[PDB]
Every structure is written in C-alpha cells, then in structure tokens.
Write a protein that binds this DNA or RNA. Structure first.
Ligand SMILES: [Mn+2]
Ligand SMILES: [Mn+2]
Ligand SMILES: [Zn+2]
Ligand SMILES: [Zn+2]
Ligand SMILES: [Zn+2]
Ligand SMILES: [Zn+2]
Lengths: 162, 162
DNA sequence: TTGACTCTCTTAAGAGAGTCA
DNA sequence: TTGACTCTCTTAAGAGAGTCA
C-alpha cells in the first residue's frame, strides 16, 4: 500500500501537528531520591484536538490521513513507529509512555514494546533507582513503592509449610 | 456466612481440604543471583478437585459451602481473607499469588491487596534483589528483566525535547 | 478529505453467577 | 447437599472500525 516515502510523510505531518500541542513541564521522581523534568506535548481535553486527530475513547485517540482517495487511520501514539516491526517474540508491539501521561504525544516520551514490558514500567524504580530496562525509563514508575497490602500470608492451623 | 464462627469454620474446612492437595516443590529465583524453594499446594488439573471446589474457568476455581440451608460461594483463593476488609483506598482487595502459580492454594503463598499491587509483583526484583514490598515477595517476578523493546524514543525533525 | 462523534476489542492479573444431575 | 460444568464481568495498560455531513 503506502510507500516508504508516504509513511515518512505521515510521520512528518504527525510530528508537525503534535509539536504545536501545549508543552507542559512536569517535575518527576527519577529514583534514588532525585527529581527530574519532563516536557509533555499534551493533546487537548476536548475537540478540536489538532489536524488529523479524533478521540475514540476517554483516553484513546486516532490519527487519520487520506492518501490517493483512501482513508488511513492509526492509533494516535503508534505513528512514530510505522517503519518498525509490529511484533516481537510473538507479542504485539504497543506504544508505551515513558512519561506515564496518556495525553502526551511527545515521541521522545514513547517506546514500542510488548504490552507486558509496557505495563511493567509502572513499577520500575527509575533511571536513578535501579532501572534495568534496556530502553531506559525516563522516570520512576507511578506505582513503585512498598504497596498497601491489607493482609499477608497466614494460616489458622498447621497444614502448611512455605 | 454471617457469623465469625461460621467464617472460621469455612476457613478451617478450606485449609483442611487444601492441605491434602499435592505438594509440589518449585525452585525459584530470589534476585541477587540466589535461588530458593517454595512448596505449592496445587489444585488438581481436572475433576474431582476436592470437597467444596469447582472450576469456573481454565485457571479459575470457586469454593462453596451450604450454611443454614443456603449455598455460599467464594473465589477459591479468597477464603483465607474472609475476615479482612474487602477494599483498600477504595480499590477492591484481591487474592495475590506470591508464588505466581495460579493452581497453588497454599495460604502461605497468598496475600490480600489491590489489583495494582498484585500485578506489580510480576516485575519485582525479588527478596534478594531489592524488593521493597512491605509484605515481602517470595520470589523475583517472572517478568523482571531488561525487556525486549523494539524501538525507543525518536523524532525525525527538531520539534521535541525530552 | 475532514471532524466529531459512535461502537466494540486485547491482555493477563483478578472476579461473580446460572444450569443441570 | 455436593459435584461438574456453563456463561460473562473488572481493571488499567493498550487497540480497530462505522456513521454522517
Ligand atoms: Mn504504559
Ligand atoms: Mn498475581
Ligand atoms: Zn510525556
Ligand atoms: Zn525501567
Ligand atoms: Zn504456591
Ligand atoms: Zn517485591
């Protein structure tokens, strides 16, 4: 279907449009008790969102372009990765927010990886706290920490050993 | 059922029955290059599973008892925690496998925590690799590691900063 | 060709409830 | 009363596709 040049043109038009989104400065934990700064390019909360963009769910958007009379549509965060393999180890690749900010469309805050890898970043200690992700996290995951477990392992009798 | 005595009786009969499940030894990564040994009490693969137990899904089971002529039914791993709050910070409490082995019903391998805390243990470095869970992990999570990211953050133009 | 809506689906950690014998 | 099946649902990280003007 679309040629390499046409895909590059889609990525370029997407970058042009997203680059004009409001840029919001966020101070974030990096791990190791350190703080850093991320600059998120945030899609608006309500229409209009930007040329080519439309909302398909509370925090889901799509990008649409019509080329040679054919309508093409992509998930709004998948566009930076259109020239990349779309699966790995038999798993579908997903857009994965390193900034953990769904509305952000900054491609410097996205990577392309399995849904399991994606989810796991939520609990990462961060780039200054022990992150071992080969594509390094930009921040400590929002869910990192001791947790809030209500009850631990326990038995009433003597039927079990750990 | 309603009474504390009736609940303790349910827990005691559940422990009785699960204590007769086959005990399967699993050697597991602890983090830090170390290995440990867990003893899982595994529900059978096919019926009959044990008095009071029935399968509602490939890896889902329910425990049922008749009290005051009424049938009471619970998810099979929730029974140890019937006297605990069923929510925390407005999030539902879930049975959470510290051994990451669904068929296991050893209550010494279970805790009671939000679904987010539950999920996050999949990526924990483990009790000898830096686990910070207040209710400590029994093993390194099965998904801990560098990941298999296909593409990292990137831009074609000069519109974005980290 | 374009915008602004609509709908349902995937995954892998977890759930509740009904039908028969 | 107990057993062995059936079905759909929840959550929070992610998706594809239809309708109308
Ligand atoms: Mn993510
Ligand atoms: Mn779990
Ligand atoms: Zn961002
Ligand atoms: Zn990381
Ligand atoms: Zn176990
Ligand atoms: Zn842990």
């Amino acid at each position: 279907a679309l040629t390499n040049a046409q895909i590059l043109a889609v990525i370029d038009s997407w970058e042009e449009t997203v680059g004009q989104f409001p840029v919001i400065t966020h101070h974030v934990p990096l791990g190791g008790g350190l703080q850093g700064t991320l600059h998120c390019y945030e899609i608006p909360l309500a229409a209009p969102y930007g040329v080519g963009f439309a909302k398909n769910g509370p925090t889901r958007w799509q990008y649409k372009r019509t080329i040679n009379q054919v309508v093409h549509r992509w998930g709004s965060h998948t566009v930076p990765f259109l020239l990349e393999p779309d699966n790995i180890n038999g798993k579908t690749c997903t857009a994965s927010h390193l900034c953990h900010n769904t509305r952000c469309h900054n491609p410097l805050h996205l990577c392309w990886e399995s849904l399991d890898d994606n989810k796991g970043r939520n609990w990462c200690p961060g780039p200054n706290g022990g992150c071992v992700h080969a594509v390094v996290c930009l921040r400590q995951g929002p869910l990192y920490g001791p947790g809030a477990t209500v009850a631990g392992p326990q038995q009433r009798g003597s039927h079990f050993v750990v």
